[PDB]
Design a protein around this ligand. Structure first.
Ligand SMILES: [Cu+2]
Ligand SMILES: [Cu+2]
Lengths: 159, 158
């Protein structure tokens, strides 16, 4: 396989937010995500700090402890599935990801076609990650929860 | 600013350094010791080295670590333990905790010679995953470990 971009990256809320997919990945620990042989893609959100990030993250750093829900809709068939992307690390660094059955899903029409993808992103405080707020070392308030949308044509597992 | 604690350690693909500074105010409230009750903010500064074996780019903050500390005054014999919590300041993410020194009601945590230990477990304990396929996979995570520092605490810098 290879790494396929999904729509255009957004710059929002002090972050660059891109979506990509690749071949299904084998992940440890076993059992917390869909096994590679049962999936058709690995969906990733690639989210890093912009310059002048208002929450203290240096430019280029991965944004950790985000809650990222996704909804994937085939607009041709109407099929919809949702889940949460989980934090993990690959050889090129940390990301948020999930293995997803597409052609292999028999409970809907998740075959080749036109898709709408939405990420629903909540800030790190939802997971109990802290921020300094004192004058001397403090940072700005976190963004409120938000959505980003992408449209893309799915043409099959990277093969 | 920040006072260095002993000398940094390089292990398991990470640079592990300790510093302290004046107490800070953290949100959300009710988790970190309140600034007025504390004498220092202790930080563990943990970043990837070159060729990190778990795929983290050089210089990246190492996230999802579980970290406890033990602080021992070697002059008095006083020892306290706690947990460092992940948070972000104006100089980026770290693991930190406000700590009562002079203001600790138990006594024995004043100006003096100290030993500081961190007990660190890997991100998989908090459910963080790793790719293990041939193309994009990375090696196994470190077993829980400790690292030790010696320093002189010269009093609260607040
Ligand atoms: Cu992944
Ligand atoms: Cu802190």
């Amino acid at each position: 396989g290879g790494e396929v971009p999904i729509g255009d990256p957004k710059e929002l809320n002090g972050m660059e937010i891109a979506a990509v997919y690749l071949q299904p990945i084998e992940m440890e620990p076993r059992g917390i995500d869909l096994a590679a042989s049962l999936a058709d893609i690995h969906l990733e959100a690639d989210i890093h700090a912009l310059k002048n990030n208002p929450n203290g993250f240096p430019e280029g750093f991965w944004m950790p402890y985000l809650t990222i829900a996704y909804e994937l809709k085939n607009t041709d068939t109407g099929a919809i599935k949702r889940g949460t992307l989980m934090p993990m690390v690959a050889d090129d660094g940390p990301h948020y990801g999930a293995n997803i059955a597409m052609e292999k899903d028999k409970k809907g029409g998740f075959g080749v076609g036109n898709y709408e993808l939405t990420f629903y992103i909540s800030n790190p405080e939802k997971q109990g990650f802290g921020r300094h707020v004192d004058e001397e070392t403090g940072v700005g308030k976190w963004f409120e929860p938000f959505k980003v949308d992408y449209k893309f044509k799915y043409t099959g597992t990277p093969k």
